[PDB]
């Protein structure tokens, strides 16, 4: 909702910042097994639950 507490807004801030793909140069690093961000959240598929 447009009405939100500071704690909930700050919580939603962290969730947006985390929902980004991996940098492409992560893959080039030695002993790398992370080929794609497996913790990607889509707003319409999976809900935060808050």
Phi/psi at 7 (nearest 5 deg)?
A: -65, -40
Compute the least distance from the CB of residue 13 to RNA, in Å: 8
Least separation, in Å, of the C-beta of 37 and RNA? 14
Sole residue written with tokens 């969730």: 15
* Rounded distance between C-alpha atoms, residue 50 and residue 38, angstroms: 20
Q: How far apart are CA 1 and CA 31, in angstroms?
A: 44
> Does residue 48 bind RNA (CB under 7 A)?
yes
CB of 18 to RNA, least distance (A): 9
Instruction: Give the footprint of RNA on this chain (CB under 7 A).
Output: 1-4, 8, 12, 15-16, 19, 41, 43, 47-50
């Amino acid at each position: 909702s447009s009405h939100k507490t500071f704690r909930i807004k700050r919580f939603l801030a962290k969730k947006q910042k985390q929902n980004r793909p991996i940098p492409q140069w992560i893959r080039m690093k030695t002993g790398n097994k992370i080929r794609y961000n497996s913790k990607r959240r889509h707003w319409r598929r999976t809900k935060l639950g808050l």
